[model samples]
Target: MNNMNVIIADDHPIVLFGIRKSLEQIEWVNVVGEFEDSTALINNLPKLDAHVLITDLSMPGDKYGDGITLIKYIKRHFPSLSIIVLTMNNNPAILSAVLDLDIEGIVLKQGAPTDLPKALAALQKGKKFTPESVSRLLEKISAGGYGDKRLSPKESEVLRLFAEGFLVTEIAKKLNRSIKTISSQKKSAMMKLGVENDIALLNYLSCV
Candidate 1:
């Protein structure tokens, strides 16, 4: 069989390095391109010539939907290309969202180094694959009765920025909104996520 061409897009340089190193060890997988941002991926995607695109869901340029927008963009522009979401979040809601997008694979970053190859292999063989951790998370969501709680677009944006270490004032500045608006959004996000305080938010983020 001919080798499979692949491109990996993530915000962290170390992650890109690790993925490239691991994938290179597999002779059948060829690493054609790598990107650290959404815009760069969009701009260079047309020239990638790769069969699969693996990407993180919460990169810097991600909007409220957690890379859902990027997924849509790729599906619209490159219907033949296989797209995989390699995200740190194992949240069932996020997994369900990606599934709704008809993505080829959903591999958590926490398990991607080991689980992603299996997912890719299965996809190549015309099967869909979900990592064990992600599957478990989805099961928990189905049973826990907590998946119904949804965040508004602004609240989701605030939560994403908070996870990236942005202060309320900083988020306000970056988002071009008032400090009060940012604070309210953050508070709403915390309440929806069941986080009582910033420390709790940080802890929750650390786990995901």
Candidate 2:
């Protein structure tokens, strides 16, 4: 295989060092750039012409922000760059949400050091690589079937539109409901999913 240029990002200094060192083991994977924030990563991406990006799910930034917003932006702008998101959260719904973005690579921070190479290998083969631990958790959630956790059709409607990047007022206008109603519906959906606030809601919505 040809040497693939790779960029990595993480908020933690130790994490960046660890990831950089791990990539050094693969002769064909070049660590082209390392960033500690989304702004730096975004600024450098176009210039680096990197083939792969291994990034933290949450990194402080001025322009791009972090989490789902950053992921959405990258997905839209850098359609060709393969992304591998390293996350600590194990919520099955959350993992599925990130996967739903077509990221195709999800690695746990707590996973073995070797998981990174394994993930890259699978990506090289044009395949998805989700840690087995996460896969089992997703399977468990699927078997549970959302049962009592099901969101109402209206709630689902509101969430679906919101997830598509609509604001509460816009969703109200689109659905012909009061803004208050839409807000409450969103809140209700969040409550059902056990999310505490907008940030947590966004995390869960990443699944939608």
Candidate 3:
């Protein structure tokens, strides 16, 4: 079988090195090109001869919407090429933003070493790959407390405190409430958002 030619784009050199090293271990994959900036990637993509483009979300560019914009540009200019977003963000809003773009995969940067190969395999099989974490995030987003006007004001306060990195006890002290009350309110907020943990809650916050 022919090797799959791939292009990697990220702002960090160490990350690029690690990804290249990992790809080198997979004999069927070829690292045909690399770029440190999205603009360069946009200019050089046509010449890369890559079957897949793997990129981070926070690359430097004039594009206001970050990686989603880049994905849209690629789809517009090279409709047949596959794109995989490897990002540190697991935000539900970001995931929601890309859902309409027809992206091939979304792999979290923290989990990419293992998840990326899975995404690649799925893409090779002509299937879209999104992690279970993303599904959970979406579910939380759909429950809708962050954007909803009907929820109690306490829930919104809890969300803001969580987003600002306040722990349960800290929030309790600031809100002049018992630890149990603070904990209950926070849990209720998470329940309304459909998230099971703080990470999931943060992911929801990041997207909004």
Candidate 4:
């Protein structure tokens, strides 16, 4: 079909409007529906038969679920539907969680304005899309000794606190270290993971 029917869901009004506007700009693309929450989106999906779904990572409001749960449900029930996830979270824990789900596209919010069309275009070609920001980060990470090197004791400590929901400043305070030191330790641990091994890193940290 020449028409690329699309539906979008995001908790933010501006995001929904922005994405619809962006989609409307493409001559062959049609904005079939725009929803503000997961329940509304999932409820309407059966009849919409949209070719693609561009949604935010978090839009909690119903039993239909949100974040990874909603995405997984959609993938299972609507196996034919292609997904493009939009998330502001830069945490590799979240990113790899989404990535390992085998999603068709991942666009960080900073890249969303210009990247949606490109993401759709890639889907048109039967390929997955990763934002330039993500790809570049992956590149920088892989070149920096991402694997074959384990985290230092301090790096592991920092990562543990971070995964436990401690803010960097809080972690620094708790550990009696400078915030810079704590942040650097966290980033250093992250640098060792990236996409190549982010899931592994998370798995490793969960036990540490």
lDDT of each: 0.81, 0.85, 0.80, 0.81
Model 4 score (lDDT): 0.81
Q: Which candidate do you rate higher for TM-score, 1 or 3?
A: 3
- Return the top candidate by lDDT: 2
Could you tell me every candidate's TM-score relative to the true structure? 0.66, 0.69, 0.67, 0.68
lDDT of 2: 0.85
Cα miss at 106, model 3 (Å)?
0.1
Tens digits of per-residue lDDT for model 1, 1-208: 7989999999999989888887877889988999988888878878778998988887766432337777787788889999888888766777888899988888877674678778878988978888778877777666343355777888778888888988789899999999988888888778877889888788887765
Cα misplacement distance, residue 23 of candidate 2 (Å): 1.0
Q: Which regions of candidate 3 deviate over 4 angstroms?
A: 63-65, 144-208
lDDT of 2 by residue, 115-150 (tens): 889999998888888778878878866633453577
* Residue-pair clashes per candidate: 0, 2, 0, 0
Off by over 4 Å in 2: 143-208
* Model 1 local distance difference test score: 0.81
Candidate 1 residue-wise lDDT at 68: 77
Weakest ten-residue segment in model 3 by summed lDDT = 142-151
